[PDB]
C-alpha cells in the first residue's frame, strides 16, 4: 500500500504492514541553510533514540510484534476481541486510552524487572 | 467572542409549522463546527433533538420524519443562521428550544466523539407555546 | 441506551461548606466520556467541566470532578451565594445523549 497507506483500515488489517513503517523513521559552512540540515539530522537522531530506548527496558528490542506477561484490567476497555480489531482503527484506539497510558507504560517496566537473576548467584 | 442569538417568543395552534432562526456571531465557516438542536419542557430534563455536522445534518430516533435542519455558511453581508422546522406540532410542544455549537477542528480535543459530542456554547432560548 | 442517575435530588448548603453530587450511570463508561452544567433559573446553561475532571476556559478553580467505575462526582468547595442552581450529569458515550434528572442547590 506504501507509507501510511492503512491509515482508513481497521486494527486488524493495519498490523500486517507494520515494516513499511518500521523503515522510515531514520531516513558544509554555517549558513542559513547549513545549520537547518545538521538540526534536523539531530532532530531524526533523537526522535530514533528515545524511541528506541522505550523498547529496551521493556524487553521488546528487535522486535515489531512483542507481548508480555502484563495482565490486561477490565476497567481499561470493556470492549470484546470483535469489537476492536474488526470495527475500530488506530486513531480512535488512542483516544480512549488516553487516561489509562501511563500506568500500561510503569506497569511494563517492572515485568522485566521481576524477571531478573535473584540468588541462582549465590 | 461567540454571541448567539435567536428569534421572539411566539405562540402556535396545533396543525401549523414552526420556523426557529439561530444566528451566530464569531463562527467563520460551519466546517469547522457543529450545531446541535436541543429543547427543555418547563418542569423537566433537557432533551437532544437533532443536529448537523461535517454538512451532515441528523436528528435521534425519537424525532425521525418529523424536524428538518438547515445551515448556511458565511455571506458576504449577514452572520451565518441555522432555521429548524417542525411540521405538525402537537400540544405536548411547549418548550424552551436552545441553538448550541461545538467546535470540532482538533482531533485529540476531547470534547467530541464520533459525532457524539458536548455543548460548550449555549444560545438564548425560544420560549414555543401552542394551544387552542 | 444509557440511564444517568443523579443523587441526591433536593439539598440544601449555605456559604462555607462543600457540595459533593453523585452520578451512575446503567453500562460502564471506560473512556469517561462525561460533561457537569449548570443553570440559573431564568438563564441558560453553562459547561464547567468535561470529561471527567478536565476544567474549561472561565470556570474557577473551586469545582472539582472524579470518576471511578461508573460513579462520577461533582465537589463544590467554598460555595459562594451565585453557585444556586439546577445541576446535570450528561453522557456522550454512545449516540444519542443523555441528560440527568436534575439537583436543586437552596440555600440555609
Known amino acids: 500500500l506504501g507509507f501510511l497507506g492503512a491509515a482508513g483500515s481497521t486494527m486488524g488489517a493495519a498490523s500486517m504492514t507494520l515494516t513499511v513503517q518500521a523503515r522510515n523513521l531514520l531516513s558544509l559552512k554555517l549558513t542559513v541553510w547549513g545549520i537547518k540540515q545538521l538540526q534536523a539530522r539531530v532532530l531524526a537522531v533523537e526522535r530514533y533514540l528515545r524511541d528506541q530506548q522505550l523498547l529496551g527496558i521493556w524487553g521488546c528490542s528487535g522486535k515489531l510484534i512483542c507481548c508480555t506477561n502484563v495482565p490486561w484490567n477490565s476497567s481499561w476497555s470493556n470492549r470484546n476481541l470483535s469489537e476492536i480489531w474488526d470495527n475500530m482503527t488506530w486513531l480512535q484506539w488512542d483516544k480512549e486510552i488516553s487516561n489509562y497510558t501511563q500506568i500500561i507504560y510503569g506497569l511494563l517496566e517492572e515485568s522485566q524487572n521481576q524477571q531478573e537473576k535473584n540468588e541462582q548467584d549465590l | 467572542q461567540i454571541h448567539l442569538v435567536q428569534s421572539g417568543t411566539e405562540v402556535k395552534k396545533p396543525g401549523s409549522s414552526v420556523t426557529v432562526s439561530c444566528k451566530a456571531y464569531?463562527?467563520?465557516?460551519?466546517?469547522?463546527?457543529?450545531v446541535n438542536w436541543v429543547r427543555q419542557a418547563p418542569g423537566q430534563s433537557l432533551e437532544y433533538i437533532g443536529q448537523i455536522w461535517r454538512w451532515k445534518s441528523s436528528a435521534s430516533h425519537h424525532f425521525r420524519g418529523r424536524v428538518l435542519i438547515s445551515a448556511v455558511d458565511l455571506t458576504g453581508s449577514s452572520p451565518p443562521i441555522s432555521s429548524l422546522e417542525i411540521k405538525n406540532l402537537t400540544s405536548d410542544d411547549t418548550a424552551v428550544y436552545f441553538c448550541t455549537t461545538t467546535s470540532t477542528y482538533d482531533r485529540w480535543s476531547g470534547l467530541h466523539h464520533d459525532g457524539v459530542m458536548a455543548f460548550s456554547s449555549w444560545g438564548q432560548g425560544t420560549l414555543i407555546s401552542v394551544s387552542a | 441506551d444509557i440511564q444517568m442517575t443523579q443523587s441526591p435530588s433536593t439539598l440544601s448548603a449555605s456559604t462555607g461548606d462543600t457540595v459533593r453530587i453523585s452520578c451512575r450511570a446503567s453500562?460502564?463508561?471506560?473512556?469517561?466520556?462525561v460533561a457537569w452544567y449548570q443553570q440559573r433559573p431564568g438563564k441558560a446553561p453553562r459547561l464547567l467541566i468535561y470529561r471527567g475532571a478536565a476544567l474549561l476556559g472561565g470556570v474557577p478553580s473551586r469545582f472539582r470532578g472524579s470518576a471511578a467505575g461508573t460513579d462520577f462526582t461533582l465537589t463544590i468547595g467554598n460555595l459562594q451565594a451565585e453557585d444556586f442552581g439546577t445541576f446535570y450529569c450528561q453522557q456522550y458515550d454512545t449516540y444519542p445523549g443523555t441528560f440527568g434528572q436534575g439537583t436543586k442547590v437552596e440555600v440555609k
Open positions: 464569531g463562527v467563520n465557516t460551519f466546517g469547522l463546527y457543529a
Open positions: 453500562q460502564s463508561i471506560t473512556g469517561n466520556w
